[PDB]
Each structure stands twice: as structure tokens, then as C-alpha cells.
Design a protein around this ligand. Structure first.
Ligand code: HEM
Ligand SMILES: CC(=O)N[C@@H]1[C@@H](O)[C@H](O)[C@@H](CO)O[C@H]1O
Ligand SMILES: CC(=O)N[C@@H]1[C@@H](O)[C@H](O)[C@@H](CO)O[C@H]1O
Lengths: 100, 371, 98, 79, 108, 94, 96, 80, 52, 94
DNA sequence: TCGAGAATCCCGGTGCCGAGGCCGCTCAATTGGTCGTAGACAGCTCTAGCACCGCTTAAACGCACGTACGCGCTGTCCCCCGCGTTTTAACCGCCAAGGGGATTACTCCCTAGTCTCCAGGCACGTGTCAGATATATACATCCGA
DNA sequence: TCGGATGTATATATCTGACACGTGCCTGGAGACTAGGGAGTAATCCCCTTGGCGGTTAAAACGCGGGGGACAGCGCGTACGTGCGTTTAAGCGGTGCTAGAGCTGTCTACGACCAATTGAGCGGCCTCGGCACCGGGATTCTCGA
């Protein structure tokens, strides 16, 4: 135990597999699905969420996120190293694979 | 004459698809996403060069040492370096003084009763950086002037373009552009630029992608709760009507748009609520994102048994030597740039008002590594 | 053989150590402890002899005063023995661990 | 270095005898060691700050005297 | 003569660097006062004020109020370890006390 | 009428920075004024003592930094120090 | 109907730990302050703020003293506070 | 001129309730009155000294604040 | 302090005599209430309940 | 070398005035020097505060007398005042 | 009560090292004028502290029960004290290097000190909207059957 | 252990006074320039801090027997909490007066500031007696009969 294991195994004595790689995420809150088990919201058309229709994510991005580029305001106290280090640290922390 | 990342072989390589004439495949590193843009590849190459230089200086320092011992020691050094740089420079500039002090108090000791597993919401709550992306890639010469050819390149043409690293002057112009370019300010009416919203991965894919829409869709796929559930989880008041939402967001147009698209604050996605909130004082995230991120990083620090500040991981003199590291020292020590920013590299973005020659700042004193 | 009842030698020691003025902690162990404590704040620190002597005098005075308060707390609860809860109560009321 | 055990049980007994304590429970030695460690940590931290401000590498008696005085524990006899 | 700009604007502060410099000069602290001491003091004072005001505003919001009263300042100070250590020997007028009851007195 | 100086407008500006829609009463402003004066006097007195100990006749930013280190407890101090430095550097650039 | 002993006491504890007002009548306290000050100087005047500040300080002092007294009483395995607890708290604090 | 009895038993009981006290003995009230008189005597003596040095006849709030700060009982809200 | 030294049959004044002088006097004890005198010791005082 | 001033000869003169046949050690003299310095600092600081409160630029005998009355406890203070007053009379006549 | 046994106190030698007294200098303290402003008077305004009265009405004050808690009084047992033996490392004395506090000396930047000029921050005036105040209602809890 | 009485939090109107802006003025902060002393580098110097070694022995460790306090359980009786009715000043307004706090003006005498002179106090050097050990006996206190 002079150095780290590559997989991060046996870091915690109580639960050696806790904190390692290729395991499930921790849910701080119970997951909500449109069927209750594994069906994402918006899978079946016409299913209302809490009495309200499920919005199209592309539509939300179109109305709310979209803004004309020509009035971009630069940050007066941050550099692009801020964004780069954020991305690098994120690539350290987590990566959720998906089937090919 | 400086090292580059080793190449990778894949069945379908997007780096080749970006430009057939150049014919440079994607690089290989500890992660498969290390070649999305030249900037990430530059950071990876810088880290690789730093590890190699540390191993060389450790071998010269201690010649009896074996290759495995050198590798493990340089691995520990680089891990502690990343931890120090992150937890000392990056997180305070994200959370701000109040949230950083609340969620990341003074370190005490290792604590095995703490779960260091990454939460599900964190993978969606750490995408706030999608709001800091500039729509252009900037490269600068040795004088921090626009380097020709192509001083500024659209971001749609730099995705997976690994050939822009090997055949376009290397990583020095990219690092110089990163150090001396302001980021993008997240405003309630300017969330994300159109380059990543309508032209993301345009060349590789059949059609352009929508990064914010991908964020909300992935939040739905993971089955994460709504905005109000997280507001209650973190301890903040939970709005119910249009007026309460406008009070929380300190904006009335945005609250009206959110209500007309979702219908209730309980349904707003975590990314939308996180990036639509007003930023903290001297911070770049709202109260909810600050809560989630601070909690996650506190868990990561307190649950790691190999924390650089933990007793026994490093010697006292080793701790004093490590506490003096900095990103500009690494940047101007592992490649050809001589002029670098001072103090917090994440804060200095004006040439030449806040730049130095890095012939003044001290290096890393390895003399405490004698066996 | 001769034997004293419990509490006789204790009172003799109380009378003996309230009449002297010497230091009741060995000097070398205290110096080593002080150096080890100061190791955390700064490396390769040197100490004058007077600095260590002053630290020892201050520490002994503090501990003796705390033990007086602790004895008062123990006597309050109709006891003769001195328990850690008495130390905790004295330090709380003094304003230290409050 | 586990030098806190250099403050032995008989030394704590002597310090309690000077304070007028007749009977001593067997659990106050660890408590006394913790109390002494906390006090010493505070005073030594202040003294080292005073030393570092003067750009010195030796902790003088005046630094200790000032560190004690700023905690309301004035000590007479060392300048 | 150029347009006068305050020193606190150059340092990017809200607290007055010039007034703090005058108070340091007139306060009989030392014979001379450096150029950077007022900036440092103003920055520290503004930081502490912002911290305590943020905590008090959060306490007021938790009470469904809009205006900060001394009760909220007391609740902010007493619920924070560092601020409570800084203001251990300080009384805040119309602050009240922190609600606690010893476990021994509760019915069992 | 003689003018009475106070730290009221600056405290209000900071409050508007932190909580843009939250007001403050008169007793709370008096308390904040007293707090600012108390902390100013504490730090300035400690800095003056530090200058006198080392036989100097100038209060510099190093004396203020050491006074902040001595007075403010734990994490607070660290953050305060950062803020202070962050100002002086900026003040030097302009 | 009648509540058991100690119930209204707990209700009062919860009630007076939420308020911020002053628990001593103002006129008797003002008279006491004037009577005390009579022994130092004759024909003295008081600002209203002076008497209010004295009242705030005195009430805070007494509340803190009663907290320490309650701790001392609980130490001796008791629920009532006696004068011996006040004396012990004051002696440990250094006031006597 | 026995105004020390103006601090009634219900007032002392309220002050004890704010301090978390559940049961109060019968002799607590005289002890509390003595303690309060001692505290008031010290503070008012210091305040009157401060007032007399200024050659004034009214005891201002600032004199009380300074007198309290002398004993180590800083008070926020009155004066500056 | 000189009176304390004389009662001890000693000519010179040592810190023990200064401590005895200060601690046995009410006004001086109140003046030097938070002051430690080096090599002064303490005042002989044993609680009456502890005595046999 | 260098010069290190202290209240040693004056303390010895007072001791010879009080106990002509009694000496004093070195540790006791260090304690007495510390005591004199501490009391000087206390009285002078209180006098400076008093002068600052009333918006005066001068420390006078009135400030010193008020500082003595505020700091010294009980009858001690009274006696001290008398001594001080007498000095300022004998100094003014001569 | 009375005697045997430790423990502490009180006397007579015997060095020894630190306190007390003597020179030699030098660096503050004294003596002798100049100057300019801080503080000592007087007037004068007008704010606020003191006094007095009448009326609700909320607080305090007596008084009667009863119950829960403070307080002795056994009884057990276990944990701390006193004493003897063995083990450990503190303490003392002496040597040897060298890091690093203290003094000089020698400029250079940096701060105080003086005019000119304005804007920033006071005081004073105004109005509207948080919040304190009633009022009925809905729970939440406690004591008892 | 389900239903009744009491207390407290909650939602809905009314009104008001205090907080948040607006405006005019003035004085304290900013922009210049100059002069000089504080402090930042260097270059010695010696001192005092650290590291080591060896011997004597005093104090820390350990083990054991036993007794004396710590803690728990059990009455008992009294004193404090809870209601309830009656008395009593507290708080709130309004009116009236004047003491003294605060500001303005003048002027004078007292403290800062120089320069020249000298002696008081500090450092270095001796030296002898007060005190710290030594030994012994004397007296005292303690505990088992
Ligand atoms: C600057 C250019 C960037 C580009 C082009 C980019 C691109 C992408 C894309 C396409 C995804 C996958 C979308 C999805 O399915 O969720 C992704 C994932 C992600 N990115 Fe970025 N990103 C950038 C910067 C950043 C930054 C700066 C951060 C954080 C500070 C960040 C954090 C993340 C996270 C947390 C994920 C989720 C990982 C996962 O769930 O597997 N990205 N990125
Ligand atoms: C339109 C475009 O991207 N052209 C580039 C060309 O300039 C470059 O020389 C070549 C090889 O690197 O790759 C391609
Ligand atoms: C000894 C210690 O620090 N224990 C902590 C505990 O205080 C904390 O409640 C828990 C969950 O975070 O983690 C563990």
C-alpha cells in the first residue's frame, strides 16, 4: 500500500470496492422514471409528467439558450485556462460509457 | 524536438475523418476523449512531458532506483500536483469565497466513513463549463501576437482535428492562446454560443449536434429528479409559481420562459436550473450548483486515503516542496514558452500587464527526495 | 510491616508540591514535544533555551490552574476523585471548549 | 514521533498535586495530554508567526512572550 | 490635470481606500503608512462585511422576511464557528439567544 | 450641522452586491458599523504592535497581512489574506 | 384540566428563546440605574440610549450566567439551580 | 429607595427561562439581585468616570459603551 | 516582597517572594490577575473536605 | 556592543529606600522590570484612548489621572493619585 | 491512650558562583530661545432630558394543592493508592562545527508635505410599501380514561 | 390509546412610519511636484545552537494486595410549579420648561524644534559572602495494639 492501485481498489477498508472504477454511481436522490423503473421521460408520447407535458429538449434549447452571437460579453476576470482545467478535471473524475 | 502523445489505432477514427489529406489518427492517453479539441490534447501532452521530466530528474537524482520505482514516484508527484493545483486555484474561483469556505473547510485527517463515489447528478452538475466556451480557438506567437496562418479558427473546424497539433506549430501557440484570452461570461440571456449548439461535431457527424439539448436529454435519460427536488435537497427555498421563480432567479422574462416551456418549477432540468441561476459573488455558479459541486469535492478530498496532505503519504519536507508548485512553472518549464501569467493563471488574461518571465519564480526542489 | 492508609501520602505530596517552585515536567521530553509540534508550522526551526523555558513555565501554570478549577468541579458533585467530565466542565465554563 | 507520551503519568500526578487534587481517576491522563497539546499548538503557532514576520529562523523568548501576551496570558521573567 | 478616479476603483473595491488611509494616518498607529496598507485593509474589511451580510441575508430569507434585523445578524454569527470565534466576547443588541435545551430536561 | 462619517453607503453597496433584493434596517446598520470599526481597530493595533516590535516606523502591507493572520481564526484568515493580496496586485497594475 | 409540572416551564423556555425583546420592565431598571449612579455623582443626567445600553448589557450578562449555572446544576445530577451553582460558575469564570 | 426590588421574581424567572433553566430554587432571586447590582455598580462607575473626564453632566451612550469595552464586554448597536 | 523574604529568614528577594507578596494582597492580586510570575509557585491551599 | 536600557538601577534605588539591608536576585529583577514596563504600557494606552475620545491632541496630567483611576483597583488607585499629584506640585514650584 | 516507625524540621561545616561595587565612555538628557497652533475662556442657540397628569390594562402578587424531585441511607464491588523491584533514560560534564543573528555602510526608492481642484458623501425632504396589528381557522400536542 | 381541551402556527385585510431615493453644498480626497530619511542589500564576525559521547543514578514502569469511595437502588417529605382571583403600577399619549451640549470667535501660552554641552547610565571587570548542599540529631505525626 505504498502507492495507489490503478483501478482504485481496496482504498476503503470497510468497503474495498467502494470508490473503485467500473461501478454504479451513487444516487443522492431516488431516480424518477416515466414508468417507475427504467423508462425515461418523453419515451411514450402523450404521457404527462406531474400533470404537465414533457418539453422537447431541442425546443427548450431553441427558445431559452439561443442568443445572437454578436453581443458576446467576455469575462473580465477569467482566462480560457479556467475552462480547460475544468474539462481536464472532469475527464479525471467521471466518464459514463454507452453501448456502441 | 519535444515529445508528443502516442498514437492510437481504432476501427473508426474521427481524427482521420476530419481531414483525409493530412492523415493523422487520434492520440492515445488515459482517456478516450483526449482529442476532442487541440487544447485538451495540449494539456495532456504537457502533463506527459512533466511526468517524463520528473522521471528523468529523479533518475539523475537517484541513479540506483529502478524504472518501476521512478514511475511510481513520478506518478505520486503528478497526482499530488494535480490535487494541489485544483484544490488551491480552481475551486475557489468556481465556488467563490463563501461557498468554498462553507463546503470545503480546513482539512483535518483521513475519514474512511466517507463515500468518495461520484454522484449521478455531478456528471450533469459539472457541465456548467459549457457556458464558458468561446466560439473561436486562438493561437499566439512568441510575442503573444496573432500567429499566422489562421490566428483565430472557428470552433466547428477544430473538433477532433488532431492534425492541427502535429502539423500546425505544436502546443506552444495553443497554450499561449489559452493563457492570454478571456473566457466567456455566463449571462442569463447569453447561456451558450451557437458554435456548440448548432455546429458541434459538424464534420464527423452527419448533422451538427446540440450540446445543451444533449445535456437535458442525458439528464432525462439518467432519471435525475427535477430542479425543485435538488433545491430541497441542498436546503434552498423551493419556488412554486411564476412570482416565486422570478424572485429566485432575479429575472422575470427568464422565469416566464421557463414556465411556458416546462409548466412547473418541479420539472425544470438540473442543468437548466443550475445555469439559469444568478452567479455567486466572485464565483461562476449559482447556489445550487455550488452546493452540489462543493459537496462532491469535499467527499472526494475527505474520502481519499492517498491525499497529498494526509500523514505518511509525503514527508514534511516533501510537503513544503510540493506546496510551492504552480501551473505557470510547469507550462514554461516543459516547453518553449518563456513569458507566462503570474499568481492565479486562471485569472490573468491580459498581455502584458500581468505576465512574467518565469526566470524569477522558483522551481520544484526535488532535493528532499534523496533516499 | 508498616503501611499508610490511602490519602496520607497524597496529602503529604500536596503539601510538598505546593511549597516548592520547581518545574514538575522533565525538560528533555518537553523540549522534544515542543520541537515536534513546531515541526508542522515550519521546517528547520531553531529554539533558544529561553523560548523552551518560557513555554514550559506557561504550560505548567496553565495546567495547575486548570486542575484547581477541576478540583472545584469535582467537589461540587460530592466527590473526591477527579474525572474527565470535571475537566470538560471547567474548560466549558472558562470559555475554552465552549 | 510520539513525544506526547513523554509527559508521563507521574508528571501529571505532580501537576495535580500542586493544584490540590487528592484522588485522581485513571482516565484523566489522556485528557490532560490532549489539553496540553491544544494549548501548546496555539501558543507555538502564534510564536512561529511572530518569528516568520521578522525573517528569522530562530524562535526567541520574546516571540513566546508576545504570543502568550496576545492570548491574555502575560508572563513575567523573560523580558 | 486628468479626471480624478478613486483609489478604491483602481483596486476594484467598494470600501473607501482614501478614508481608510486617512484613519490610519490620523489614528496614531505608526509614524509612516505605506501605499499598499490601505488597500489591504479595505479589501479585508469588505471581505468580512460581505461574508457576514451573506449569512444574515440567508438567515432572513429562511425566515420569509425581506429586511435584515439584528436577530438575523445574531443567528448568522452564532451558527458559524469561525465568526463565533471572532465575536466571542461581543454582544449584539436585540439579538436574543440561540435556541437550545439540554437533553436532561426533556421528558423521557 | 456637523457631518457624521460612517460606513453606511459602503455596507449598503456590498449588501446590494450579495443580496440585490434584500434591505436592511437602522439597528442592523448600526451593528454593522460597529463591527467594521471594531475589526479595523483590532487589525490596525496589531499591525502597529508588529511594527514597534521589529523597530520599524512604517505600517506596510506585510504588517497588515501578519495582523490578519494572527487575529482572524482559521479558514477565515486564509480567505481574507487572499482577498487582500488580490487587491494590492490590482492596485499596482493600474 | 391541569398540566404536569415542568410542561409550562418547557413551553416558556421555547417561547423566550425565540423572542429578542427585553425581559425586565424599563421603569424599575431606570430607577435602579439612577439610584446606583447617585453614589458616584450628584445630580446626574442620563441619555435614554445610555439606560437602554445598560439594560441590554445586563440582560445578556444574566442570561449567559444562567446558562453556566444550568450546566453546573446538571453536573451535580440535578434539575433545579441553587445559589451554589451560581457561586461555582462565577468562581470558575474568575469573577469571584 | 429600595429599587433593587424592582427586578421582580417573574423577571428573574424569565431571564432564567431564556437561559434554558427548567426548575429554579427559591433562594436564586436574592443571589441574582446581588450579582446584578455588582455588575451595574462596576459598569456605572466606569461610565461616570468617563463622563467626568469630559467635564459633562449627562452620561451619554458612548460612555457606557466604552465602560463595557473596558471590562471586555463589547456591545454592538449603540454608538459607533 | 521584602517582608515575605524576611519572614522566610532570607536576605535576597527571589520570584517566590514576589509571588507570595502579590497573591496574598487583594488589590495587587486583582491588578495582576492574568499574569504569570516565573518560578513563583502557588499559594498553599487545601480544600477542607479533603482533610481527614 | 550595544546598549540595553532597563528599570534596574531605579528599582534598586527604591528597594534601598524601602529595605536598606535586603538585596534582590536577577530573576526577581527581570520580573520587576517586566512589571514596570507592563504597567507603563497599560496606563499610557488608556491615556491615549481617553485623549482620542475627547478629540484632543495632547496627553496631559488629567489623562494620566483618569487612566490611573480607571485601571488601578480600589484604594490602590486613590493612593497612587495622591503620589502623582504631589510630584506635579513639587515639580511646578521648582 | 500508647509505643514503634517513618518523615520532616532544625542545626553546624564547606565551598562557590552570582550579586554588588568600581572605572571609562558615549550618547541621550538638560539649558537656552523661537514659533505657531491647540486649547482655554466667553457667548449663544436650541435640543433633549426631566417633571407632571390621566387612563387602560397587562403585570405582579397572594394563596391553595399536589406531585416530583432533592436528600439521606444502605450495600456492593472495583478501581485507585501505597510499596517494593527492576529497567530506562534523564541529567551533567566536556568537545567541536557552523548556521545565522547582529553590526556597518551606502545608496535608492518611497513617503511626507504643499497647493488646486473638483466630485463624493453628507444633511434634509418625501412618499410608498414591508411589516406590525386584528381575526378567524386549522392543526399539533398533552393529559387522562 | 381514542377523544377532549388548550396552545400555537397560518392565511386574510388595514394602516402606518421608516427605509430607500433625490437634490444641493462643501470639504476631504486626488493630481502634480519636491526633499530627505528609512530601509533594503551587501559584507564581516562571533556566539550560541545543535549534535555527539560517556557515566551515575534518579525517576518512570510494573506488579500486587486491599480498602474506601463511586454508583445504584429505595423511601420520604417538602418545596416548587400550576391555576386563579385581586391589586398595582407600567406604558402611552400629551404639555411645559430649562439645563446644558454643541458650535463660533479670539487670543495666548505651551509644546515641538533646533543647537551646544556634559554627566548619568551602561558595559566590562573583580571579589567575597549568602545560599545550596552535606551530615547528624530532634520533634512530630501516624497507625496498629
Ligand atoms: C470546450 C469544448 C467542449 C466540448 C466540445 C465538449 C463536448 C462534450 C460532449 C459532446 C459531451 C457528451 C454530451 C453528452 O452526451 O452528455 C461532453 C460530456 C461532458 N462534458 Fe464536455 N465539452 C467541452 C467542454 C467541457 C467543459 C469545460 C466541461 C466542465 C468544466 C465539460 C464537462 C462535461 C461533462 C461533465 C460531461 C459528461 C460526461 C459523461 O456524462 O460521460 N465539458 N462534452
Ligand atoms: C482546408 C484545410 O483544412 N486544408 C488543410 C491544409 O491547409 C493542410 O496543409 C493539410 C495538411 O495538413 O490539411 C488540410
Ligand atoms: C470521526 C469523524 O470525523 N467521523 C465522521 C462523522 O463525524 C461524520 O458524521 C460522518 C459522516 O460524514 O463521517 C465520519
Amino acid at each position: 500500500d505504498k502507492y495507489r492501485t490503478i483501478t482504485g481498489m481496496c482504498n476503503n477498508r470497510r468497503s474495498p470496492t467502494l470508490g473503485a472504477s467500473n461501478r454504479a454511481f451513487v444516487r443522492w436522490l431516488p431516480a424518477e422514471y416515466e414508468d417507475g423503473f427504467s423508462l425515461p421521460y418523453g419515451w411514450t408520447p402523450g404521457v404527462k409528467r406531474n400533470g404537465f407535458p414533457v418539453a422537447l429538449a431541442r425546443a427548450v434549447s431553441n427558445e431559452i439558450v439561443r442568443f445572437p452571437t454578436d453581443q458576446l460579453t467576455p469575462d473580465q476576470e477569467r482566462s480560457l485556462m479556467f475552462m480547460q482545467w475544468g474539462q481536464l478535471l472532469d475527464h479525471d473524475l467521471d466518464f459514463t460509457p454507452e453501448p456502441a | 524536438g519535444r515529445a508528443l502523445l502516442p498514437f492510437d489505432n481504432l476501427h473508426d477514427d474521427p481524427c482521420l475523418l476530419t481531414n483525409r489529406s493530412a492523415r493523422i489518427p487520434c492520440f492515445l492517453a488515459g482517456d478516450t476523449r483526449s482529442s476532442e479539441m487541440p487544447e485538451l490534447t495540449s494539456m495532456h501532452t504537457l502533463l506527459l512531458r512533466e511526468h517524463n521530466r520528473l522521471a528523468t530528474e529523479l533518475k539523475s537524482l537517484n541513479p540506483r532506483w529502478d524504472g518501476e520505482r521512478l514511475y511510481q514516484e513520478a506518478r505520486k508527484i503528478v497526482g499530488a500536483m494535480v490535487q494541489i493545483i485544483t484544490y488551491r486555484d480552481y475551486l475557489p474561483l468556481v465556488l467563490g469565497p463563501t461557498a468554498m469556505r462553507k463546503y470545503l473547510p480546513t482539512y483535518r485527517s483521513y475519514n474512511d466513513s466517507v463515500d468518495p463515489r461520484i454522484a449521478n447528478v455531478f456528471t450533469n452538475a459539472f457541465r456548467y463549463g459549457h457556458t464558458l466556451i468561446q466560439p473561436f480557438m486562438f493561437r499566439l506567437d512568441n510575442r503573444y501576437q496573432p500567429m499566422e496562418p489562421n490566428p483565430r479558427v472557428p470552433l466547428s473546424r477544430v473538433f477532433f482535428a488532431s492534425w492541427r497539433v502535429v502539423l500546425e506549430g505544436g502546443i506552444d501557440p495553443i497554450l499561449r492562446g489559452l493563457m492570454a484570452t478571456p473566457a466567456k461570461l455566463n449571462r442569463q440571456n447569453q447561456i451558450a454560443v451557437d458554435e456548440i449548439r448548432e455546429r458541434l461535431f459538424e464534420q464527423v457527424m452527419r448533422i451538427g449536434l446540440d450540446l445543451p439539448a444533449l445535456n437535458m436529454q442525458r439528464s432525462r435519460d439518467h432519471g435525475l429528479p427535477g430542479y425543485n427536488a435538488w433545491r430541497r435537497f441542498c436546503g434552498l427555498p423551493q419556488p412554486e409559481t411564476v412570482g416565486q421563480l422570478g424572485t429566485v432567479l432575479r429575472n422575470l422574462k427568464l422565469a416566464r420562459k421557463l414556465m411556458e416551456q416546462y409548466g412547473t418549477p418541479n420539472n425544470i432540468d438540473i442543468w437548466m436550473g443550475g445555469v439559469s441561476e444568478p452567479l455567486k459573488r466572485k464565483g461562476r455558479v449559482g447556489p445550487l450548483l455550488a452546493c452540489i459541486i462543493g459537496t462532491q469535492f469535499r467527499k472526494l478530498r475527505d474520502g481519499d486515503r492517498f491525499w497529498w496532505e494526509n500523514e505518511g503519504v509525503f514527508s514534511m519536507q516533501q510537503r513544503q516542496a510540493l506546496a510551492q508548485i504552480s501551473l505557470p512553472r510547469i507550462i514554461c518549464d516543459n516547453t518553449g514558452i518563456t513569458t507566462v501569467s503570474k499568481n492565479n493563471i486562471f485569472m490573468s488574461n491580459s498581455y502584458p500587464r500581468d505576465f512574467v518571465n518565469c526566470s524569477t519564480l522558483p522551481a520544484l526542489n526535488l532535493a528532499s527526495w534523496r533516499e | 510491616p508498616h503501611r499508610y492508609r490511602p490519602g496520607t501520602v497524597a496529602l503529604r505530596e500536596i503539601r510538598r508540591y505546593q511549597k516548592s517552585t520547581e518545574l514538575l515536567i522533565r525538560k528533555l521530553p518537553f523540549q522534544r514535544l515542543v520541537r515536534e509540534i513546531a515541526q508542522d508550522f515550519k521546517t528547520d526551526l531553531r529554539f533558544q533555551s529561553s523560548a523552551v523555558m518560557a513555554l514550559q513555565e506557561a504550560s505548567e501554570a496553565y495546567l495547575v490552574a486548570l486542575f484547581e478549577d477541576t478540583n472545584l468541579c469535582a467537589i461540587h458533585a460530592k466527590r473526591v476523585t477527579i474525572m474527565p467530565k470535571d475537566i470538560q466542565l471547567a474548560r466549558r465554563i472558562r470559555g475554552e471548549r465552549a | 514521533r510520539d513525544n506526547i507520551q513523554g509527559i508521563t503519568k507521574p508528571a501529571i500526578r505532580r501537576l495535580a498535586r500542586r493544584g490540590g487534587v487528592k484522588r485522581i481517576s485513571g482516565l484523566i491522563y489522556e485528557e490532560t495530554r490532549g489539553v496540553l497539546k491544544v494549548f501548546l499548538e496555539n501558543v507555538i503557532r502564534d510564536a512561529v508567526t511572530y518569528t516568520e514576520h521578522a525573517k528569522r529562523k530562530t524562535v526567541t523568548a520574546m516571540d513566546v512572550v508576545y504570543a502568550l501576551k496576545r492570548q491574555g496570558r502575560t508572563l513575567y521573567g523573560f523580558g | 490635470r486628468a479626471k480624478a478616479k478613486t483609489r478604491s476603483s483602481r483596486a476594484g473595491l467598494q470600501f473607501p481606500v482614501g478614508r481608510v488611509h486617512r484613519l490610519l494616518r490620523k489614528g496614531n498607529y505608526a509614524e509612516r503608512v505605506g501605499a499598499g496598507a490601505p488597500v489591504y485593509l479595505a479589501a479585508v474589511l469588505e471581505y468580512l462585511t460581505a461574508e457576514i451580510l451573506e449569512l444574515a441575508g440567508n438567515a432572513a430569507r429562511d425566515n420569509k422576511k425581506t429586511r435584515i434585523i439584528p436577530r438575523h445578524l445574531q443567528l448568522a454569527v452564532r451558527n458559524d464557528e469561525e465568526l463565533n470565534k471572532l465575536l466571542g466576547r461581543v454582544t449584539i443588541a436585540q439579538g436574543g439567544v440561540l435556541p437550545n435545551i439540554q437533553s436532561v430536561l426533556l421528558p423521557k | 450641522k456637523t457631518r457624521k462619517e460612517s460606513y453606511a453607503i459602503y455596507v449598503y453597496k456590498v449588501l446590494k452586491q450579495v443580496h440585490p433584493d434584500t434591505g436592511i434596517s437602522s439597528k442592523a446598520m448600526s451593528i454593522m458599523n460597529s463591527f467594521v470599526n471594531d475589526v479595523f481597530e483590532r487589525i490596525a493595533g496589531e499591525a502597529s504592535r508588529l511594527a514597534h516590535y521589529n523597530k520599524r516606523s512604517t505600517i506596510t502591507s506585510r504588517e497588515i497581512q501578519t495582523a490578519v493572520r494572527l487575529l482572524l481564526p482559521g479558514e477565515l484568515a486564509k480567505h481574507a489574506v487572499s482577498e487582500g493580496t488580490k487587491a494590492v496586485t490590482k492596485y499596482t497594475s493600474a
